Structure formats: C-alpha cells, structure tokens
Amino acid sequence: SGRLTGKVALVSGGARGMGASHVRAMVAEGAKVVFGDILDEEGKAMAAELADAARYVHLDVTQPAQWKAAVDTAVTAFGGLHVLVNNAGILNIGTIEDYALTEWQRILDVNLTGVFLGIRAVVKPMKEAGRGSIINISSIEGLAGTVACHGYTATKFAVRGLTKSTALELGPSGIRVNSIHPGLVKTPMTDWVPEDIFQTALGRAAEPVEVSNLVVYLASDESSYSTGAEFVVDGGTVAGLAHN
Amino acid sequence: SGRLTGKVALVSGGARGMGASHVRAMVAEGAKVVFGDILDEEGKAMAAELADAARYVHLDVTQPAQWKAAVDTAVTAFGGLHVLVNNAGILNIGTIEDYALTEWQRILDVNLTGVFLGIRAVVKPMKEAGRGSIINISSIEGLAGTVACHGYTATKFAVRGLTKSTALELGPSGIRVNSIHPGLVKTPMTDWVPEDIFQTALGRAAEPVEVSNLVVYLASDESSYSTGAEFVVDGGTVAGLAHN
Amino acid sequence: SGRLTGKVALVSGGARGMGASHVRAMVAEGAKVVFGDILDEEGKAMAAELADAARYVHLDVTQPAQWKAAVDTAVTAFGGLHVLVNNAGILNIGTIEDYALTEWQRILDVNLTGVFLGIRAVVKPMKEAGRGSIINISSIEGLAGTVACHGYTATKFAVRGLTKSTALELGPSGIRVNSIHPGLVKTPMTDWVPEDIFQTALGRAAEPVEVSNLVVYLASDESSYSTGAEFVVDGGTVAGLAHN
Amino acid sequence: SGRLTGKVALVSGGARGMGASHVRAMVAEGAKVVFGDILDEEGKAMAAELADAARYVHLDVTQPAQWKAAVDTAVTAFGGLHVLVNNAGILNIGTIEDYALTEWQRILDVNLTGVFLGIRAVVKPMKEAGRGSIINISSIEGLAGTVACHGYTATKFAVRGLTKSTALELGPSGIRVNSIHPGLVKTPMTDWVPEDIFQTALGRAAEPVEVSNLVVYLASDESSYSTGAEFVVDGGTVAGLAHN
Ligand SMILES: NC(=O)c1ccc[n+]([C@@H]2O[C@H](COP(=O)([O-])OP(=O)(O)OC[C@H]3O[C@@H](n4cnc5c(N)ncnc54)[C@H](O)[C@@H]3O)[C@@H](O)[C@H]2O)c1
Ligand SMILES: NC(=O)c1ccc[n+]([C@@H]2O[C@H](COP(=O)([O-])OP(=O)(O)OC[C@H]3O[C@@H](n4cnc5c(N)ncnc54)[C@H](O)[C@@H]3O)[C@@H](O)[C@H]2O)c1
Ligand SMILES: NC(=O)c1ccc[n+]([C@@H]2O[C@H](COP(=O)([O-])OP(=O)(O)OC[C@H]3O[C@@H](n4cnc5c(N)ncnc54)[C@H](O)[C@@H]3O)[C@@H](O)[C@H]2O)c1
C-alpha cells in the first residue's frame, strides 16, 4: 500500500482486461489514474466505482490529438503525469496467404504506432517533473515467433525495440522506459485460447493481477535503476526449449 | 566457386550499397539475379555490366503490385525463384519531440511493411519449388536501441521478429527465413557517420562484401539447417558492454 | 510494507555489499533472514543489530555441508525456508595469457558451483512448503563479454543458464527461479572501478538498495508468474549499443 | 573447394561424431587438420584415410600440457595454426536430486574449462600470424534451459559467454571468436534421443555435415567481420515459443 503515493498515471486500453486490472492495482497503491479506451460504456462504468482516484477519457491510441487530450486531462485534473502504461492493443492472426494487408496495417497502427504516439504525448510533463516511468506492454510474442501471427509478432518485437531507443534518449531527463512480456493471460483477447497453449514451468495461465503486480513495481520508484529492459512474466515458457 | 549455381534470386534495393554488393556476389557464385530499386539510373547501369546474369526492375518495396511484377520477371526469365534478399531500406532520425510523424510512417512502410510484402510475393514460387531461402536485412539496431533513432530501431526489431514468425510457418514447405544484423557498413546510407562510431573488437567498420559473404552462405544450401535465426556481422559490437 | 511477512529467507554473501543490503531490505519487509558468509567478523556484527529478525552463519558456498547447515538453521530457527538469494561471488581479472588457472578454477567454484550448491540445498524445504523463490545474482557480464574478464563472464553466463534449467524443473513444485543482472553497483567488489565506466541512460552507477528492491519483488508472491527470467537493473547499459 | 586454402586447423574431439565431420569438411576445402581426442583407436583410423591432410594427436582437453602439444604439432607439422574448433564435449543428465557433484564437476572440466584451455593454447601462434578464427561449439541448450540438464546447460551457456569475452580481447590481434549452437544432431552423443524431440520448423534432426558447413564458413575469411557472435543451426527451434 502507498507504493505509488503522489503518482499520477495514464493507462491506455484500461476499460477492460489487463488494462482495467492495472488501473485498479495502481489505485490500490495510492496512484491517481486517468485511463483511456474506445469502450466508453465500460470505461465510464468502472470510472464511477473508482471515481475518487480514477478518470475515464475516450482515447483512440492511433490519434495523436486524443493522446494530447488524455495527457492534459491527467495534468489538469490530477496535477501531473508520472506513469504511462502503453497497454492498448489488438490481436489478429492469419497465414502469409490469408492475412489481409488491411489487418497488417491496422495492427501496426494500434500496437506499434499507438505506443509511439503515447510516448510522444507524455514526455513534456514528465520532463518538467524531472521523473517518470513508461511501461510498454509487449509479450513473449515479442521475444520469439508464432505461426500465422506475423503482424502481432512484428509489432510486439517493435515495441520491445522502441522501449530501448526511447529509454536511452529519455534517461537523462529522469524518465525510465521498460517493456513487459507476459505469456497467456486470462482476458477477453485470449478467451478463445486454451489456457495450456504454452509449455509453462508453472503449469497454468496467468491471472491479470499477476501482470499488474509487475506494472506497479515498474511504475514505482523501487525500480529506479531499471530502464530499457524486458520484464518477462510468462510462467517460464521462454526459459525453455520447445520440445515435442 | 559455383556455390549458388542453379539458384535464382531476387534482391530489393540492389541498385547501390550492400544490395548491389549482394547482387554481384551472388552472380559471381553462379546465381541468376533479378534486382529491384527506385534508383533506376544506377540500377540499369549495373544491369548492363552484369549482362545475362542479372535483370533490373523498378521496384518500390511498399507496393505489392511491383513486388509481384519482380517475381514474375524472375520466374519467366530464369525459370523460378529460390532466394529473396529483403535489403531495401531507409534511415531517418530525430528526437521524440522533433521526429516527424510522416518520417515514422514512411520508415514503417519501407523497412517493415516492405519486408513483409517481399515475403508474401515469393511464397508461391518457393513453395512450388519445395525449397527457398529468405534473407531479411535487420541490423544491430534490431538488437539494441539508439538515441533519436526510433523509427529505425522499431522497424529493425520488427524485421527480426517477422523473420521468426515466417520461418516457423514456411519451414514445413522447405523454405528457410533468417535475419542478418550488421554493424556500421561503408555505404551511402551511413557515409555521414564516423566509421569508428561503434566500439568494435576488430577496430573498423564493415565493407559491404563482408556482409555479402553472409548473404551467399544463407542463400546457399550450405546453411540448410539454419532458419529463424539471427546472424550478426558487426565486428563484435553487441558482444561487448557499452563503456563511457 | 510487510510484503515479505511470513517468509523465511537464506542469503549467501550477506555480510557486506549487496548481500547485506538484501538482508536489511527483506527484514524491513517482514522476512526472517538467515545469512551466511566467510567474513564472520562483519557478519556477526550486523546480525547483532538485526536482532531476532536475522541469524548469521558461517557459510563457504563452495561447501555442500555448510549449505546444509545454513538451511537447517533457517528451518529450525524460523520454521521453514521460502526464499534463497544466491548472492555470494568473487571478481578476478586477467588477460588470456596472464590469467592464472587457479583463479579460473576458484571463480568457477564460487560463482557457479556455489550457486548450484545453494539451489540443491534448498529444494527439499521448498518442495515441502509447496512454494519458493530462488534468486540468482548474475550480472550484465552474464549478457555480454568483457576484455580480461573470462572467468567472471563465463560464470555469470552460466548462472543465467542454470537459472533456466532449474526453473523448468522446479516449477511443477511451486518453486520459481529467476536471475538478476545488475550493472555497476557501488560495493567493495568494484570500488576500484570508476563509477561511470558504463554508458548508462541514467548517467550514474547503482546503489545497492536499488538492486535490493528487485530482490524483494522477486522474493515476494507479487512476482508469482515470473520464473526462469532475467531481470536487468543496469541503468540502461545493455539496452544500448557500445559507442567508441 | 579451396575455401580454406593455406589454413591449418585444430579440432578437439575430432575422432568421431561432429568433430570427425568437421575435420573431413575442412580437409575437403583445402585445410590441413590436426585433430585430437581420447579415442586413439578411431583417431588413428581416420587419420590413416586422411593422412596427407590430417594428423591425429592424443588430446584430453582437461589437460593444458596436452593442448600445448596439440598446438605445437600443428605448428611444427603443418607450419602454423589459424583455426580452432573447440568441439570436444560430453553429455550427462540428472535432476537436482540425483545429479552427482562428481558429474557436475566433470562436465565443467570438459565442456567449459576444456574450451578455455584450448583458447589459451592457440593464441600464441595465431597472434604471431596476425589472423585466426576460434569456433566454440555451444548448443541451443546454451540459449535456453532443459529439465535435468543443469551441468550441460550451465557449461553451454558459459561457453557462449566465454566466446564473447575472448572475442573482445583477441579482436585487436586479428583473431575472431564465435560460437555455434546446434539443435539435435545425429551423432553417438544423442543416438538414444528421438530425432523429433525438438519442435522444429524443418521437421527433422540435423545431419552432422549441416553443422560442419557452418564451421567451414566461420573458419574461412568469408566471415571476416563476424566475431563474438552466436550462430544458430537448429532447424528453427529457438525461433519459436514452446507450445503444447
Ligand atoms: N491476453 C493475453 O494473453 C496477452 C499476452 C501478452 C500480451 N498482451 C497485451 O496486453 C494488452 C492488453 O491485452 P488484453 O489481454 O487486456 O486485451 P483486451 O482486448 O482485453 O484489452 C485491450 C484493450 O485495448 C483497447 N483498445 C483496442 N484498440 C484500441 C485503440 N485503438 N485505442 C484505444 N484503446 C484500444 C480495447 O478496447 C481493450 O479495452 C495488449 O497490448 C495485448 O497485446 C495480452
Ligand atoms: N549502411 C549501414 O551501415 C547499415 C548497417 C545495418 C543495416 N543496414 C541495412 O542494409 C540495407 C541496405 O543498406 P545500405 O547501406 O546499402 O543503404 P543504401 O542507401 O546504400 O541502399 C538502400 C537501397 O534501398 C533502396 N530503396 C530505398 N527505399 C526503397 C523503396 N521504397 N523501394 C525500393 N528500394 C528502395 C535505395 O534506393 C538504395 O539503393 C538497409 O535495410 C539498411 O537498413 C545498413
Ligand atoms: N559490485 C558490482 O558492481 C556488481 C555488479 C553485478 C553483479 N554483482 C554480483 O553481486 C554479488 C555480490 O556483489 P558485491 O558487490 O556485494 O560484492 P562484495 O565483495 O561486496 O560481496 C560479496 C560477498 O560474498 C562473500 N563471499 C565471497 N566468496 C564467498 C564464499 N566462497 N562463500 C561465502 N561468501 C563468499 C564475500 O565475503 C562478500 O561478503 C556477486 O555475485 C557479484 O558478482 C556485483
């Protein structure tokens, strides 16, 4: 408790799934949270139950103007902005033959460009504050490949890289940038996926809060010397070789 | 030797720099090469000296129709297509604040989407042949970050990941996909960069042919059991830790 | 908070430096800690101030019998053992020609075998508890090489690998195994090294507690879905490319 | 053919398996080869059929004196020494509970120390020549973990690291050092292992010559700008995530 005292965070894609879990987890640690999404109905709903510590904003991460508005909301409503959780993302699949180029561009827009746009938008207030933490949500698909998962793999790897380039540039201003790489997490994005799809050492899929616990760590000043790094929370999948 | 005799290859961005070096290197090893670029003047120039061993075609890697035309050219002129070298690429830079969104979009289109389009275009002729080798040109900027080099870092990391997802999917068809990661290479793309910018064990920048030698290895059947892997040719930069 | 209340931990090399910082940090979070070392003077000294929260034991990590005695101490004094911090280690250097074989053998014994012996010693009490967290201290020298630092590099890379093999094997028993990779940390091991030797995004060396914060996270149940993974705390060094 | 003209190489563990394959492959490319092992019967046998281009020497890689003798044999019998293939290795397994410490030390001695001793022994003549290539045989077990494979995993990771530290130190002298990481290869070491143990994109185990082709590339001057790097030849295993 209180591990995020005085902190203000902005979470993209926070109306449901892991994003919603991150909002709740940070609020529980004392942070004020602005969360944006395109699911306004659900967004306003949870904002009502977290009203005193969180605010919902309509945010399509593919639009820079909306990102600016989200950041201004945090600054004007809560006083500042110290944490950014680039969580918004989509999942589409397809083999090289069936995958539509429109699907490829769409996932690049949301999963990659959306993350970059978020970073661009939060740096001004963070630099003025002299401190900040940017947490980009990648995945283990950003560490290795998967059949018929080209756009998703490409963007998750890209996010992994962008985390490092921005980390190097922003470090001198007191802003850390790290990426989180989870394995299968029980959320609506993978509800159709069997929980044991991956070979894991722990033998189970993850609960969203297990990823939120990592977000809290990275958002807090406890992780003050970690930047440009990959934090894996996958139950051990990438730690082992793929066996038959 | 004639390490590539019987092989037909398609090289993007082959009008100059490493691309041109790769075309010459493979032709020297007995390959028939179709190479495309947007620099038609220079492209047609070298096509003339390479005689009946190589054909030049205008190819903007961001356009799927042009990729298809280049592949059709290779199949009709040489009877098939067994090797693809996704070499075309651009370099732009800028801090998070100053970097233009148009530049970000353009580099994603050329460096990332262009590579994916190349893969899509060659799958058919390669699967028909039951064999194939796709070589994607990433870089050490696809292994670590660089200040004010976000679009480039993101795309090179993306290419690294796409190499893996496609390798897994195409393996069953006898097609290998690998990525090459060079350090500073002496070409027009980085002629404005001091040659000793990187801390190398070899204490020098790379010569294009030194990368072409790796392209030949991966294009040949000698590398038959290597796929989805990263081949680093950087003089030792990423093998060491960055010192101040 | 009391993020480790109820947990019992064993820390090797806990008489000074990071080890001592880890013991203090975990005790502050409610853990009961048994810490061992070969520096008995300093070890007993801090055990006295930590009072009933910590016990000091002489522990040469190269000796299996001493590891067993330390574990028995933890179980008898605190009722069990849930966390192991394999922190003991030494640093020696030398060029390929000048580096003494005795030094190579000694560092393998302490930095590598010592870590394995620790893992062996705690498996029983942890499996009995059905839970556990093993934290192995590697370093960025376990991610990249360093001139005239062969024994150290080899062992730190080995620890990184051992972390994975054991994580996979122990996962089914509810035991997590992860590795920590710090950059330059201000301790007596590297006091002879200039603090700005590495190119860091944060432009400074690490403080021991900054690593201890990561140890606490991994020791706590908050990191329940992370195992077999590398946690980097280097201020951004490995996230960037080495410049000359 | 002739890709190793004028080159003299030393191969440890070359009496059978991959080592024997490497000897044959390099001899076929014009290299003179001294190969050492502890299987003298078999060693002298193949030396008789390759007599004009290869010489067998008794070499226990755990003994520095024997390494010196092997190097002197290459220098005095063939005129110099330009390539070293640290191939000698053993495989033992066991869970944390059953694995004997004698087995652990033995594999550290052969797989790790043996490799270091080889590097120490070849540097003198290589530095005098001003050029050389050291090829260390690691494995994908040096990139990820495996249950009940602790000593093997630890040593293969260690070899991976030692490759980088030595590469950085030796680069200025014109000596490159790289590591090879193969997947399952059909040799007597894994004859008891099912060929489809790993999930591979190519759907088959490797033939030793497929690894030897990589040794030839790295031994040749074609790979002149690659050093401190990992070359994976595993049919795509590590390129993908472990799925059930
Ligand atoms: N579910 C998993 O197993 C898993 C594993 C690794 C990584 N991830 C990543 O975690 C993130 C969240 O995943 P999730 O499991 O909660 O999925 P989810 O579908 O539940 O939530 C994603 C959220 O992003 C919002 N969103 C989508 N497009 C948006 C846009 N253009 N602008 C703003 N908001 C947008 C969605 O409405 C939704 O609320 C994603 O980046 C995903 O790739 C998920
Ligand atoms: N120069 C280096 O140091 C270095 C280091 C690592 C990686 N690389 C990569 O190697 C590749 C080639 O680099 P280079 O050094 O020869 O650069 P270069 O500028 O000399 O050549 C790149 C070529 O691509 C062509 N090209 C650009 N956009 C194109 C498009 N849309 N369609 C078709 N062709 C297009 C250019 O006209 C040019 O001929 C790039 O992918 C680059 O990122 C270069
Ligand atoms: N100092 C750094 O910058 C740095 C960076 C990365 C990793 N590390 C690692 O962190 C660990 C602790 O480092 P430190 O900075 O506190 O060094 P340190 O010298 O201050 O402490 C190491 C401790 O281990 C003890 N020790 C040594 N050999 C032992 C043995 N055989 N049995 C039991 N105890 C033994 C020492 O007496 C000492 O108390 C080591 O594994 C080291 O490699 C240190």
Ligand SMILES: NC(=O)c1ccc[n+]([C@@H]2O[C@H](COP(=O)([O-])OP(=O)(O)OC[C@H]3O[C@@H](n4cnc5c(N)ncnc54)[C@H](O)[C@@H]3O)[C@@H](O)[C@H]2O)c1
């Ligand atoms: N077989 C595989 O699938 C596979 C996969 C990855 C890596 N590797 C590695 O490749 C290398 C060769 O493997 P292999 O498949 O040919 O095994 P192998 O058993 O056929 O050959 C290993 C050789 O090393 C020799 N040797 C063993 N201990 C020695 C010592 N102390 N001194 C000198 N020589 C010694 C053996 O007598 C034998 O000729 C090893 O390092 C192994 O770990 C093998």
